[PDB]
Fold this protein.
Amino acid sequence: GAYTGLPNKKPNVPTIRTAKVQ
């Protein structure tokens, strides 16, 4: 669902939340 799955939603614009962190 989510880009990672931690939150788990559905959509995922980004490829990884790690990108936002970086």
